[PDB]
Ligand binder design. Structure first.
Ligand SMILES: CNc1nccc(-c2cnn3ncccc23)n1
Length: 338
């Protein structure tokens, strides 16, 4: 027996269809799950609307992760009462049967689910642009000084559609996030989306989220991860295939340079395609009909369009976090509509 019979051996609440909580919520069904716990669809009888309830595991490490998340969501929703900056809206929270519960507006599928729905062939350049404009607007909001929030775990699974039929999105999952200032986490970001400064053990800031976004947008259009490393050494080598050896002024200051490289004064890889020869121009199919040639003869996919997309992505994937494009200027780029 766990939690007087209410929990399973994984620290999760055992969902019961139709259960009533607190003379208020009627639980309907499970709609999502993850490391944190579970997400259920429930009817809020007081506000007369469907809600999603994120039920955190009954275990101290998971509870405390979610307490950080609640504080950051309360700070954000407070500075965006009109809900125009593409962050999920936390309505309220409570403790129930030894689980912290977060009540949200109900959302649809995540962007990984959308990629599966394309048979891993990618969404159109027009839909990629709509997702990009919303994501850059969210990053602009997180960079406002009273917030200064680094999400730290951007990936397709943490971006949800509002509606299955439409392009509107919201960002979720602030459990691993932090605020600019004191360096606390040195181990951060899911591996495929992890920035070079984190791989190299260097100082970091909000620019790590822009790196992740560049990786995500390429994957949304091609159907597959840009840099799919099996471990940190493989990850750095896959980055170098596309982007070349990082600049010497960065490696000369990197605590973990010698995990990957050796030092003419110039740096090279430790003993893949030669550095910089796996061109983004060819991954995107700029001149050859898009990914897999499958966009040949479709509207919305011209050479000029692809050159603008490539230009923006290369600015998001700058090795130097001081010169990598920032949200304000990404929004002004000619890839976006006037
Ligand atoms: C699944 N539907 C759904 N609808 C609304 C909100 C959420 C959600 C909020 N935070 N998180 N964190 C992680 C995963 C999902 C979620 N989810």
């Amino acid at each position: 027996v766990y939690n007087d019979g209410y929990d399973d051996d994984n620290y999760d609440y055992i969902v019961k269809n139709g259960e009533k909580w607190m003379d208020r919520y009627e639980i309907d069904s499970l709609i999502g799950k993850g490391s944190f716990g579970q997400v259920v669809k429930a009817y809020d009888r007081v506000e007369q609307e469907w809600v999603a309830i994120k039920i955190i595991k009954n275990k101290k490490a998971f509870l405390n992760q979610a307490q950080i998340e609640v504080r950051l969501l309360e700070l954000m929703n407070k500075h965006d009462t009109e809900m125009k900056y593409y962050i999920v809206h936390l309505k309220r929270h409570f403790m129930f049967r030894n689980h912290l519960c977060l009540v949200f507006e109900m959302l649809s599928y995540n962007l990984y689910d959308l990629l599966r729905n394309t048979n891993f062939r990618g969404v159109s350049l027009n839909l990629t642009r709509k997702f990009a404009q919303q994501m850059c607007t969210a990053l602009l909001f997180l960079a406002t000084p009273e917030l200064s929030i680094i999400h730290c775990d951007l990936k397709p699974e943490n971006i949800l559609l509002c509606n299955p039929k439409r392009s509107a999105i919201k960002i979720v999952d602030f459990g691993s996030s932090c605020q600019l200032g004191q360096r606390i986490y040195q181990y951060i970001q899911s591996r495929f989306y992890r920035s070079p400064e984190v791989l190299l053990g260097m100082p970091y800031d909000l620019a790590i989220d822009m790196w992740s976004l560049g990786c995500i947008l390429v994957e949304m259009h091609t159907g597959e991860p840009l840099f799919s490393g099996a471990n940190e050494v493989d990850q750095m080598n896959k980055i170098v295939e596309v982007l070349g050896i990082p600049p010497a002024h960065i490696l000369d200051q990197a605590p973990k340079a010698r995990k990957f490289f050796e030092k003419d004064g110039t740096w090279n890889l430790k003993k893949y395609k030669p550095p910089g020869t796996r061109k983004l121009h060819n991954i995107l199919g700029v001149e050859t009909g898009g990914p897999g040639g499958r966009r040949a003869g479709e509207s919305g996919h011209t050479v000029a369009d692809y050159l603008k997309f490539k230009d923006l992505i290369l600015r998001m994937l700058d090795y130097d976090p001081k010169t990598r494009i920032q949200p304000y200027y990404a929004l002004q780029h000619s890839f976006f509509k006037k």
